[PDB]
């Protein structure tokens, strides 16, 4: 009597991910008060208006 | 924070930095009226410098 077996396994995993999130503004003022010009100009990003 | 940049701003009238400069060379100055041989003064300036 004999015997034989063979046994193989091969498994592959692979994965990948990218983000690229680009944010630009450029508020813009004339005249008025030189404070209220930089206060309003400064980006409020959450209130851009 | 908007309010910093707008107290900034505020403070700024008051004790600015120079931005832009248009600058001539100081032998400009140098003038007849009050100097004798202001040519040559002005000559040698412009050497020197």
């Given at each position: 009597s004999s015997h034989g077996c063979k046994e193989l396994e091969n498994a592959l995993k692979a994965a990948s991910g990218t983000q690229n999130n680009v944010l630009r503004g450029e508020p813009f003022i004339r005249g008025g008060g030189a404070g209220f010009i930089s206060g309003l100009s400064y980006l409020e990003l959450d209130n851009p208006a | 924070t908007a309010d910093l940049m707008q107290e900034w701003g505020d403070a700024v009238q008051y004790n600015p930095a120079i931005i832009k400069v248009k600058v001539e060379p100081?032998?400009?100055?140098?003038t007849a009226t009050d100097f004798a041989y202001s040519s040559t003064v002005r000559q040698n300036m412009k050497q020197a410098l």
């Amino acid at each position: 009597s004999s015997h034989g077996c063979k046994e193989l396994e091969n498994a592959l995993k692979a994965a990948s991910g990218t983000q690229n999130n680009v944010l630009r503004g450029e508020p813009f003022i004339r005249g008025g008060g030189a404070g209220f010009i930089s206060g309003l100009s400064y980006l409020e990003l959450d209130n851009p208006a | 924070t908007a309010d910093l940049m707008q107290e900034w701003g505020d403070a700024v009238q008051y004790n600015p930095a120079i931005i832009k400069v248009k600058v001539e060379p100081l032998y400009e100055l140098v003038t007849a009226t009050d100097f004798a041989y202001s040519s040559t003064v002005r000559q040698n300036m412009k050497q020197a410098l």
